[PDB]
Amino acid sequence: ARTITYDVFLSFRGEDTRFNFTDHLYSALGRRGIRTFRDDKLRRGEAIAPELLKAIEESRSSVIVFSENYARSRWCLDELVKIMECHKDKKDPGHAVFPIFYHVDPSHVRKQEGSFGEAFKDKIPRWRTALTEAANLSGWPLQDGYESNQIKEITDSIFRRLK
């Protein structure tokens, strides 16, 4: 099998979900022994760090925390493109993808597939494909609930599917 260094690459829009959903999700994954690389520990900039791309290639799966502004970030969308390329290309093992819809409807994320104009021309085709594929995978469509228990259910389900 190919070389795997993490169970989960965690992709998210920090301004939306770092406080506290994704911070708590990251900790909860680790407490379950789910080895996770979170995407926000590297200095940002105009270009995505090559070390981020390598972490995606080295992970068994990605968890995407969709939120209102995830599809409104070039950074997030460029990560998503790499994640979905690995989901299509990687083998033995594959690269699984698990979307969380955090207080945003899947239909709303789908509608953002056509809204790359109002959000911001050679990148948009690839962004649209990756966003479409990811929004269509089976995941967790969260409404306003008890967040600690939502995270418990999500991490237990990731545990069952991975570990």
Q: How many domains does the chain have?
A: 1
| Residues designated as active site | 79
Nearest partner of 83 among 97, 101, 99, 93, judged by Cα: 97
Q: Is the preceding peptide bond at 50 cis, omega within 30 degrees of 0?
A: no
- The technique is X-ray
Resolution of the structure in the document, Å:
1.7
Residues in Cβ contact with 39 at an 8 Å cutoff, skipping those fewer than 6 apart: 9, 10, 11, 12, 52, 55, 79
Q: Which structural domain, as residue segments, surrounds residue 113?
A: 1-163
Residues of the binding site for NAD(+): 13-18, 45
Quickly tell me which residue has 């469509």 as its tokens.
141
Contact 159, 109 (CB under 8 A): no
